[model samples]
Target: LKSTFDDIKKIISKQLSVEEDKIQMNSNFTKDLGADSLDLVELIMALEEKFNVTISDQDALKINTVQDAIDYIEKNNKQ
Candidate 1:
């Protein structure tokens, strides 16, 4: 299984136009990636598509930083 930070890095770099090195565990989604609400929503959607899993709204809300998202998905993935 992928590590939480690894997953976050892949998605952020691929979808957010940010370098993997630029993203950190504490980096804020909006502050770091320049992601607005819609971009964040789309990023979550992209993650779901990439991972082939669904993210609950509550879970998505918890994904404030890249590591949070990665950790959540890694810990809760059904598959």
Candidate 2:
């Protein structure tokens, strides 16, 4: 899962203009990373494209934290 974390870190870092090291598992996209709704949507879309997975609107809504997204991708990308 290190690769997953790395990819996620890169994505979040680029999107939020933060250092990759600052993007921890517990970091919330909006609260911690200062991402708005549009930012979240873009992140989700990027994640979907990178991982080749489909995230429903409901699932997307559930992914509030970095760990939430990492877990979702790990769980779904296994199939």
Candidate 3:
């Protein structure tokens, strides 16, 4: 597993109160993890800071799954 995956799951699990084991690459943020708009945004902000990336609002909205966020970090992370 990538470090981005580990970090993403920790953030998602913490933000949405879901267990890390319950989350998967294909898990939808809303449908599977019970994330609302606020929860998603918070997770986005957390990821951006943690990974040293700037995820635009438009891009943020498209990140709907754990792997979406992980891939973005792996692809865009400056550090």
The C-alpha TM-scores of every prediction are: 0.58, 0.63, 0.64
Q: Pick the TM-score winner.
A: 3
Badly placed stretches (over 4 Å) of model 3 are: 16-18, 58-62
Worst 10 residues of 3 by lDDT: 58-67
Q: What residue pairs clash in candidate 1, if any at all?
A: none
User: What's the CA RMSD for each of the models?
Assistant: 3.4, 3.0, 2.8
Give the candidate order by descending lDDT.
Answer: 3, 2, 1
If both were scored by lDDT, which would come out higher, candidate 1 or candidate 2?
Answer: 2
Candidate 2: deviation at residue 28, Å?
1.7
Worst 10 residues of 1 by lDDT: 1-10
TM-score of 2: 0.63
- Tens digits of lDDT, candidate 3, 1-79: 6455666666777786655566564656556766577877787677667766656684454456656655666677634
Across 20-76, the per-residue lDDT of candidate 2 in tens digits comes to 565564656556766577866676667667777767574444455656665676688
Query: How many steric overlaps are in each model, in order?
Result: 0, 0, 0
Quality of model 2 by C-alpha lDDT: 0.61
lDDT of every model, 2 decimals: 0.61, 0.61, 0.63
| Candidate number with greatest lDDT | 3
For candidate 1, the C-alpha RMSD (Å) to the true structure equals: 3.4
> Cα lDDT of model 3 overall?
0.63
